[PDB]
Amino acid sequence: AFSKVITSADGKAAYVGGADLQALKKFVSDGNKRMDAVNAIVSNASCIVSDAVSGMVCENPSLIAPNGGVYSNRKMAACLRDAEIILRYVSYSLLSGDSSVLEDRCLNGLKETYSSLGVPAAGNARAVAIMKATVNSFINNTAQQKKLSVPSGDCSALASEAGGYFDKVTSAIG
Amino acid sequence: FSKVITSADGKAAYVGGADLQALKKFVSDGNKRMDAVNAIVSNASCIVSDAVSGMVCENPSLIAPNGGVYSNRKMAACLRDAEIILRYVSYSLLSGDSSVLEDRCLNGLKETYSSLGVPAAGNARAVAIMKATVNSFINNTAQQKKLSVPSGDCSALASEAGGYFDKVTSA
Amino acid sequence: MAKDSKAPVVEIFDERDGCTSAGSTGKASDAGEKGLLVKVSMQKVGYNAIMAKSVAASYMNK
Amino acid sequence: KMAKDSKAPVVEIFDERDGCTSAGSTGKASDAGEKGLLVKVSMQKVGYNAIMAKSVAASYMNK
Numbered sequence: 212a213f214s215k216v217i218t219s220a221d222g223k224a225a226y227v228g229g230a231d232l233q234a235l236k237k238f239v240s241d242g243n244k245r246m247d248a249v250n251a252i253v254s255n256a257s258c259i260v261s262d263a264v265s266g267m268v269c270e271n272p273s274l275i276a277p278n279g280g281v282y283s284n285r286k287m288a289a290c291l292r293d294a295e296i297i298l299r300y301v302s303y304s305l306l307s308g309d310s311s312v313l314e315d316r317c318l319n320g321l322k323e324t325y326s327s328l329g330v331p332a333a334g335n336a337r338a339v340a341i342m343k344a345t346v347n348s349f350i351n352n353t354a355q356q357k358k359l360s361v362p363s364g365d366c367s368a369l370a371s372e373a374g375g376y377f378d379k380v381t382s383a384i385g
Numbered sequence: 386f387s388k389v390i391t392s393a394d395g396k397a398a399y400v401g402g403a404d405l406q407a408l409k410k411f412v413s414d415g416n417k418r419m420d421a422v423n424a425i426v427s428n429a430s431c432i433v434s435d436a437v438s439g440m441v442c443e444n445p446s447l448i449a450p451n452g453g454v455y456s457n458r459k460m461a462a463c464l465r466d467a468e469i470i471l472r473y474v475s476y477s478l479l480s481g482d483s484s485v486l487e488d489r490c491l492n493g494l495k496e497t498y499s500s501l502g503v504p505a506a507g508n509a510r511a512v513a514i515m516k517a518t519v520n521s522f523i524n525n526t527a528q529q530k531k532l533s534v535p536s537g538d539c540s541a542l543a544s545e546a547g548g549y550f551d552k553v554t555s556a
Numbered sequence: 557m558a559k560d561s562k563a564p565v566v567e568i569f570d571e572r573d574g575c576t577s578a579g580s581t582g583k584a585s586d587a588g589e590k591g592l593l594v595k596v597s598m599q600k601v602g603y604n605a606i607m608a609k610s611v612a613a614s615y616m617n618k
Numbered sequence: 619k620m621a622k623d624s625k626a627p628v629v630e631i632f633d634e635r636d637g638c639t640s641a642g643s644t645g646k647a648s649d650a651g652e653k654g655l656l657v658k659v660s661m662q663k664v665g666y667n668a669i670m671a672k673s674v675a676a677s678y679m680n681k
């Protein structure tokens with residue numbers, strides 16, 4: 212059901228409830244916890260992206276100076292867009308339990324795209340690293356300001372899995 | 386704007402060029418006023434969340450069982466209303482008067498809330514926190530989120546916005 | 557008062573840096589005011605479950 | 619090779635078991651055995667956000 216809407220890429224939604232949802236959660240591992248882990252990402256998407264791009268810049272203000280990777284509103288906006296694109300492909304990898312769509316539709320050829328535009332790899336890797344850390348805290352419900360109410364228990368396998376998807380991004384950025 | 390406010394159907398009015406020059410000509414501090422409005426509306430989600438959160442943290446009886454904002458349903462209605470009020474205040478600052486705020490948002494609101502049992506002290510505090518937050522954003526004195534504008538003094542616009550919040554509090 | 561849950565959504569546009577999109581042309585004349593526009597529309601303010609849940613879980617954290 | 623359309627999968631998670639109901643709560647999928655629960659996925663273009671871009675430029679030095 213999800214593969215079809217990814218492949219059509221036409222904006223129409225797939226809705227999974229009922230028996231289909233019961234089956235989905237038995238097919239993936241840790242199914243109910245996985246729903247919560249996904250929500251921990253997507254419900255915080257704007258927070259994750261803003262904080263990561265902001266941290267990339269605060270650690271290297273050369274990025275916002277003339278000739279810098281995010282100088283001008285145009286380039287900052289493209290960078291915030293990309294961070295959200297990446298985050299959302301990570302979120303879908305966590306929903307589906309694999310990275311195939313992330314690797315094929317988002318990452319394949321991305322280093323060369325960035326190289327030829329001079330999108331700086333160190334800043335990019337750092338934005339990804341900050342998103343990775345932020346997502347880890349949200350999945351584990353250990354963020355300092357925003358909390359998620361869920362049944363108590365352990366989500367460290369899911370947190371590790373999400374971290375591995377970020378590592379695939381890092382290894383694609385080079 | 387009066388046409389789109391009265392139709393209330395979602396069709397937008399777009400004011401540029403000579404129409405925008407005229408808008409600004411007939412209000413005080415026209416360019417600064419645009420920036421002051423942006424300082425509110427571009428932060429609307431921040432302002433509303435922080436104000437309702439502060440209303441509750443200072444008075445958790447509001448989120449006790451059967452309290453004013455207990456249950457997601459009631460919390461969501463309260464966040465909605467805080468945004469409604471904030472947006473009518475923002476439009477008052479754009480247009481330079483409170484007529485639409487008073488007529489479309491506030492007239493009869495006291496009785497509406499009293500009959501639903503929506504607490505007056507909680508409402509007052511949410512409004513007071515939004516008032517303070519807006520004042521900082523207009524003056525660009527917030528701790529985290531900043532607005533880049535030409536340097537100067539927006540005290541008059543800040544006081545005008547505060548007066549619109551005072552009209553809400555009175556109601 | 558109205559009872560439609562609608563409020564005036566004011567948007568301020570300042571595109572004087574030259575970054576444009578499809579929406580940047582055709583909505584109004586720009587004579588004498590390049591890159592500048594005020595947009596107002598009446599929109600229902602919808603309930604936000606994610607924010608409601610967040611506030612209930614997080615309000616004690618400034 | 620990667621896509622070039624700026625589209626990404628937008629995943630939404632719905633848990634309405636507290637009972638709060640809206641129009642969208644009904645009719646989007648069968649709910650048998652999973653009352654109040656739904657996963658939605660769609661592919662959407664990620665649009666530029668001028669307000670956030672301007673905010674980061676002005677604010678990034680504040681944690």
Ligand SMILES: *CCC1=C(C)C(=O)N/C1=C\c1[nH]c(/C=C2\N=C(C[C@H]3NC(=O)C([C@H](*)C)=C3C)C(C)=C2CCC(=O)O)c(CCC(=O)O)c1C
Nearest residue numbers: 258262265266269341344345348353354355356357679681
């Ligand atoms: C939306 C922001 C947020 C809320 C709300 C919340 O409860 N947690 C939030 C974010 C969050 N951030 C991190 C980790 C980092 N964030 C940054 C960027 C900021 N640090 C700066 O120095 C800076 C410029 C001055 C920033 C902007 C950085 C660098 C990190 C650390 C990354 C790392 O290498 O570990 C987290 C994870 C840690 C935590 O739970 O606090 C979270 C949840």
Ligand SMILES: *CCC1=C(C)C(=O)N/C1=C\c1[nH]c(/C=C2\N=C(C[C@H]3NC(=O)C([C@H](*)C)=C3C)C(C)=C2CCC(=O)O)c(CCC(=O)O)c1C
Nearest residue numbers: 431435438439442514517518521526527528529530616618
């Ligand atoms: C989006 C939030 C925000 C950012 C980002 C930023 O840079 N400034 C922000 C908000 C902001 N808040 C205030 C003022 C108040 N906020 C509260 C609520 C919080 N206080 C609590 O005790 C609490 C629960 C633990 C909260 C949540 C309160 C009470 C105030 C003060 C209201 C008053 O009576 O004066 C401001 C304005 C003050 C400032 O500039 O820091 C701003 C910008």
Ligand SMILES: *[C@@H](C)[C@H]1/C(=C/c2[nH]c(/C=C3N=C(/C=C4\NC(=O)C(CC)=C4C)C(C)=C\3CCC(=O)O)c(CCC(=O)O)c2C)NC(=O)[C@@H]1C
Nearest residue numbers: 243244246247248351352361362363364365366633655656
């Ligand atoms: C790590 C992510 C955090 C954590 C998670 C956790 N969740 C559960 C149990 C449940 N979670 C759900 C949630 C959903 N199921 C759905 O179908 C949907 C909509 C798509 C959602 C949001 C459900 C239904 C359960 C089952 C129990 C219940 O109904 O309340 C657990 C318990 C263990 C388990 O495997 O069931 C845990 C640990 N908890 C944490 O503390 C981490 C921060």
Ligand SMILES: *[C@@H](C)[C@H]1/C(=C/c2[nH]c(/C=C3N=C(/C=C4\NC(=O)C(CC)=C4C)C(C)=C\3CCC(=O)O)c(CCC(=O)O)c2C)NC(=O)[C@@H]1C
Nearest residue numbers: 416417419420421524525534535536537538539570592593
């Ligand atoms: C308080 C609000 C803050 C402050 C404001 C401030 N702004 C200006 C000058 C200008 N602001 C604009 C902005 C717009 N005009 C529009 O029509 C629109 C779109 C609807 C916008 C966004 C403009 C055009 C100017 C004129 C200067 C310029 O050409 O850029 C000033 C300068 C004084 C003046 O009145 O012009 C000030 C002080 N400044 C602050 O420091 C407060 C935090």
Ligand SMILES: *[C@@H](C)[C@H]1/C(=C/c2[nH]c(/C=C3N=C(/C=C4\NC(=O)C(CC)=C4C)C(C)=C\3CCC(=O)O)c(CCC(=O)O)c2C)NC(=O)[C@@H]1C
Nearest residue numbers: 228457461603604605638639640641642643645646647654
């Ligand atoms: C009560 C006011 C609370 C609230 C509810 C609210 N929900 C939505 C949107 C959706 N809810 C669902 C959930 C389902 N649809 C189904 O058919 C099923 C059974 C399988 C479920 C569990 C969905 C799918 C949506 C989105 C619909 C879509 O994609 O078009 C809203 C938004 C408005 C609407 O009615 O669509 C709201 C307001 N929100 C709150 O804040 C209260 C706590």
Ligand SMILES: *[C@@H](C)[C@H]1/C(=C/c2[nH]c(/C=C3N=C(/C=C4\NC(=O)C(CC)=C4C)C(C)=C\3CCC(=O)O)c(CCC(=O)O)c2C)NC(=O)[C@@H]1C
Nearest residue numbers: 284288401575576577578579580581582583591666667668
């Ligand atoms: C560059 C990529 C930057 C960016 C731009 C951006 N703008 C919009 C939307 C609008 N821009 C305007 C401004 C005008 N329209 C006009 O006709 C005039 C002349 C009078 C101006 C100054 C308007 C009104 C809109 C809204 C359009 C509408 O209501 O339908 C967008 C959104 C997408 C779109 O094209 O509508 C974007 C992305 N955004 C950035 O982040 C970059 C910094």
Ligand SMILES: *[C@H](C)[C@H]1/C(=C/c2[nH]c(/C=C3N=C(/C=C4\NC(=O)C(CC)=C4C)C(C)=C\3CCC(=O)O)c(CCC(=O)O)c2C)NC(=O)[C@@H]1C
Nearest residue numbers: 453454459462463466490503507508511558559560561562
């Ligand atoms: C939040 C600070 C406080 C809070 C709010 C709350 N309000 C309601 C219910 C209503 N609010 C309105 C307000 C408007 N409707 C409009 O159309 C407009 C202008 C366009 C406004 C200002 C109305 C009409 C209602 C009743 C109808 C409705 O539900 O939408 C509630 C729900 C109350 C209930 O128990 O049903 C709540 C929770 N509550 C608090 O405790 C805070 C102090």
Ligand SMILES: CCC1=C(C)/C(=C/C2=NC(=C\c3[nH]c(/C=C4\NC(=O)[C@H](C)[C@H]4CC)c(C)c3CCC(=O)O)/C(CCC(=O)O)=C2C)NC1=O
Nearest residue numbers: 280281286289290293317328334335338621622623624625
């Ligand atoms: C759906 C999958 C998909 C992806 C992944 C994607 C990425 C992508 N990012 C691009 C640009 C860009 N990406 C960035 C991002 C950044 N700059 C920085 O300095 C930071 C390190 C980083 C943010 C963290 C920037 C600034 C550009 C514009 C580069 C330029 O014009 O010079 C481009 C070139 C075309 C364009 O500008 O839109 C592509 C194709 N496009 C897609 O369709």
